[PDB]
Amino acid sequence: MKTAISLPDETFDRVSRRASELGMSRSEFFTKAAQRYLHELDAQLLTGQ
Amino acid sequence: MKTAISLPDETFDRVSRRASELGMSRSEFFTKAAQRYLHELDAQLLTGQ
DNA sequence: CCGGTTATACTATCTGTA
DNA sequence: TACAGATAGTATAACCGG
Structure with missing residues (x-):
């Protein structure tokens, strides 16, 4: 179903x-x-190794 | 403001x-x-070229 | 009781058919 | 070109936790 996320204006x-x-x-x-x-998470964690 | 993300079940x-x-x-x-x-967009900017 | 996240709901705009 | 439907977004409400 459709989701509603509360995000800022900027x-x-x-x-x-x-x-x-x-x-x-x-x-x-x-x-x-x-x-x-x-x-991005797998790339950042692999680079930090 | 609120975001409207229309996502299915999967x-x-x-x-x-x-x-x-x-x-x-x-x-x-x-x-x-x-x-x-x-x-990853910043990495796409430099690595992209 | 008061907020925040989350889903429903209504409305508007785009698109496709007649 | 005009109308009806479908989809997306703003808007509104509901439930849970602190």
Whole structure:
């Protein structure tokens, strides 16, 4: 189902700006940023080793 | 402002799984997902060229 | 009892068909 | 071109925890 996240005004402006810059939606941006979140976490943890 | 992320049943289950894996909520998940997206975006800027 | 997160709900805009 | 439906976003409410 649809989700509602409580974000600030400056952060919401950045998310909507990079979402329009990439050419995707906000639901698609979250899906790509959720998988890329695991790619960034695994990359940062591996680099810190 | 509030965010409207339209997620199905599979994507929502995976988002709540990685959120519980980190030990944070979905609100802080997006805050760190956007910060992680910007960290990998900076690496995409230099490494990209 | 008071907030915060989360889901529902209504409304508006875009798109596709007639 | 006009209308109806579908999808996304702002808006509003509900439940749980401190």
